Write a protein that binds this ligand. Structure first.
Ligand SMILES: Nc1ncnc2c1ncn2[C@@H]1O[C@H](COP(=O)(O)OP(=O)(O)O)[C@@H](O)[C@H]1O
Length: 338
């Protein structure tokens, strides 16, 4: 009879819905229809029904079957990283057939700084797949992967259930950033809940504590990246280990010239010809302002380098263009660190 109390079915059957969750959603509506300003149940089910709609099922993005188009971008987001470029392609060649992903999840390990999350961005762009990230740092219980019960207010579903609410497709690229930091002390171990989400036998029967009914996940392509090897043994099993650590000066220079410099020039509100940073200034950042195997502090210095450039142009409009080389790099980054 009311407006919102009647506008619940406007997205239960209008939006797609499976079989076991169809009438079960209305079975949860059975606890309603009695009153409306009532509290507890009349306020939890409406939130529960709301969380039952924003979750995607029978709705996905079309993944292509092409292969070189992925090779065409695995050299775009970087270059190839010597080898390993083929691996990512080798993994996507077998996934171009039956939808059950099934294979070892893929694990991008290495020192902090190496393109781990960035590689996860390209694999989603390669297969036309949507991207979402879930950092596994600070998780110390099972109440994160699998949500809480359907108690009073607050008890929201699992973290992955909330990520599916954003990316409204059944086939997103779920990144598990830094699985090393995943602690297992409080409520059992999140690795047990992390097994049923990637294991091919029970990924289709993933049950969340809040969202009562199960939720298929055999169409999601998971990418679990980290740094060290401190991961639970049942997780390392059935996961493809990909190691990448080495980074030379010339490799850091190429990454900065193709990606790090164009990215920070744009973010810092600089136009195309407003800032020129030649190769010596990039090398000077590597040798005296950043010590690292990856390129994170290399990118941290450019975010400051382009920062001061837009500052100098704003404090002196008589400047149309700032040039930074190995000689005047210390005027912007301050004194050298190493
Ligand atoms: N080999 C690389 N090629 C291109 N860009 C890179 C590379 N390595 C790192 N990056 C840059 O680093 C950023 C993200 O770093 P990330 O890989 O997330 O660090 P971490 O692995 O420590 O989380 C991206 O924006 C990306 O442009």
């Amino acid at each position: 009879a009311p407006d919102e109390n009647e506008a619940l079915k406007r997205k239960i059957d209008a939006a797609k819905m499976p079989k076991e969750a169809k009438e079960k959603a209305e079975a949860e509506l059975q606890k309603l229809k009695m009153m409306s300003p009532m509290s507890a149940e009349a306020t939890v089910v409406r939130g529960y029904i709301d969380w039952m709609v924003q979750v995607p099922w029978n709705a996905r993005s079309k993944v292509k079957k092409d292969l070189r188009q992925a090779q065409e971008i695995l050299d775009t987001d970087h270059y190839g990283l010597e080898r390993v470029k083929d691996r990512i392609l080798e993994y996507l060649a077998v996934q171009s057939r039956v939808n059950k992903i099934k294979g070892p999840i893929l694990c991008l390990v290495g020192p902090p700084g190496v393109g781990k999350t960035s590689l996860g961005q390209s694999i989603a762009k390669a297969t036309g797949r949507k991207y979402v990230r879930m950092a596994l740092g600070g998780v110390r219980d099972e109440a994160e992967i699998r949500g809480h019960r359907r108690t009073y207010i607050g008890s929201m579903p699992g973290k992955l259930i909330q990520k599916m609410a954003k990316v409204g497709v059944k086939n997103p690229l779920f990144l598990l950033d830094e699985i090393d930091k995943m602690s297992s002390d409080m409520r059992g171990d999140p690795a047990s809940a992390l097994l049923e989400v990637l294991d091919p036998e029970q990924n289709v029967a993933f049950s969340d504590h809040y969202l009562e009914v199960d939720y298929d996940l055999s169409d999601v392509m998971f990418v679990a990246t980290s740094n060290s090897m401190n991961i639970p043994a049942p997780l390392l099993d059935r996961m493809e280990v990909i190691r990448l650590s080495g980074y030379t000066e010339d490799e850091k220079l190429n990454i900065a010239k193709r990606h790090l410099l164009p990215k920070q020039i744009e973010r810092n509100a600089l136009k195309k010809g407003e800032l020129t940073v030649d190769d010596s200034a990039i090398i000077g950042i590597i040798r005296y302002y950043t010590r690292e195997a990856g390129v994170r502090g290399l990118e941290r210095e450019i975010s400051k380098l382009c920062r001061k450039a837009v500052k100098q142009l704003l404090l002196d409009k008589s400047l149309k263009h700032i040039e930074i080389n190995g000689d005047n790099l210390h005027d912007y980054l301050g004194v050298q660190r190493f």
